[PDB]
Amino acid sequence: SGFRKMAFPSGKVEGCMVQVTCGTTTLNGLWLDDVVYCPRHVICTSEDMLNPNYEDLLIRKSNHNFLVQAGNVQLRVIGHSMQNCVLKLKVDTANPKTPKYKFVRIQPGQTFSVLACYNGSPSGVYQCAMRPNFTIKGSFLNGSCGSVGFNIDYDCVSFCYMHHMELPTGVHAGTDLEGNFYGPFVDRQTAQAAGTDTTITVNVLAWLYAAVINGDRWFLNRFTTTLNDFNLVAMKYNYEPLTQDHVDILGPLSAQTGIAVLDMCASLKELLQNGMNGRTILGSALLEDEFTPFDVVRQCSGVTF
């Protein structure tokens, strides 16, 4: 019993973290096979940060200008290239600790684990969701750039996020491992604002099923609703519209609990309109939306890796 924000075990990713230095900037890199991946702004200096011409800045850089260290060992850089917003440094040694891995671009609403790193060394691990506005609400200090986010399926690591920057509002922006930002963000020191941060409805519903599985049942009401009627309510509370695809994804949890999804929608509707009245659900006083239906099933069924 119990329900916690649970990260994947990070050992397979720890063995891939390296330090990358160029000129006077150091940040984190990801060493898989004979390639090191890192944010391209490692090549920026203080005066280039407002509007850097990255292709021009790279003309000034040769292989030996990139210092890559794994522990106290340095890998010899034998090629370099830019792919969107990431640099790819070819080294002459394949990482012996390379796990089975894939690169994936995740959808808004999906979750992942972050291994926060400084100077190529791990500091901690925590679970994040890609917000609907393509930010993440992480915990990142200066020097954390190049830390990665990932999911694990048994023995295969799916890398989905590389951290690039903090926005002035204190939320976080980054890329997939092909260097394409999530959202409209650019890697420069300019005024960037995130759009409206809406709530991931299908995740809230999944967490309510988690609560029922754990015996927290006070919020189960005596109504049902329809998709269109629920969505009129969700729109006023800046919740994402619920679709039949979402209902189908909640199928496993509905079957386990015997609570129809539209019945659970009616309970959420009353929670939104009446609040929680000083009560809690799974130890929280607000509706939690950073657990996916898969996250709930994994945690309530003991899936291992």
Added chain:
Amino acid sequence: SGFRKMAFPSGKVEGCMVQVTCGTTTLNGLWLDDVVYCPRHVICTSEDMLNPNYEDLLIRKSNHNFLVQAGNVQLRVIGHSMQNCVLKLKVDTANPKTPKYKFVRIQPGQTFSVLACYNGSPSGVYQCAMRPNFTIKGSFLNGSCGSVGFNIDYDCVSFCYMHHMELPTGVHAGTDLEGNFYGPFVDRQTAQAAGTDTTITVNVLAWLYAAVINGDRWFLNRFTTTLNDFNLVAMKYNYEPLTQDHVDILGPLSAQTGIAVLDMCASLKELLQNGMNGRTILGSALLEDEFTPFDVVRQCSGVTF
């Protein structure tokens, strides 16, 4: 910026997890040097669970009755003994992945990371606090027994918790790595209740300092208070009494923010008496008490391992 419940990187502990089978019970073990540590109730059968005589049950067990597997390899058991509520199985191979480690018995209010495991394989990692009543509010399913909790100081793993059991109320109880339970709990299927679950005051204060560091300042009031006056308030809300030792431990955060501890106590006092009025602090609608002052400093200063 940002503040998250952050676990230690788990790689050093992942390499120590094994599966232990005795008769028909399987659970998790911790393999360090040539010893495997696990809960002694691995030797119980269905009929012994209400009141097992563990010393009598061990008479019936020889070395070859203990099956210990690390991945697909089995370690040969060459001795066994009981230390309080843990079994110590001597194997003929030292774990090549043994980290620098220590065993520690933590105090109530201190935090640690849990690597939840099933069948010797890691499922996830999350941060826990030892409650004042010596329970933990974990996420553990059947078969998680023998999962361990730990802290890391640079390169040294301090193991502090081995999971043994769930209470009927759904909270969790376990031992230090010398097999001594935290709290009054016993490893048998009998009615055990936890005592009153009080709030860790020094941790709430640390988290309020974390909030100020992150710019969440709305709760900073215009009063101060005294230790004795604050403690009259904390007693009514089942908060732990604040001591001068606690004030001193908050010294680093007080110095960083310029907010005297007793001023922060006055802000907490008003939060307790008036509630949060539908506002949030670091994304939470309730006062969080599972971050220690050290946890806040680590997360707000980027300490690595």
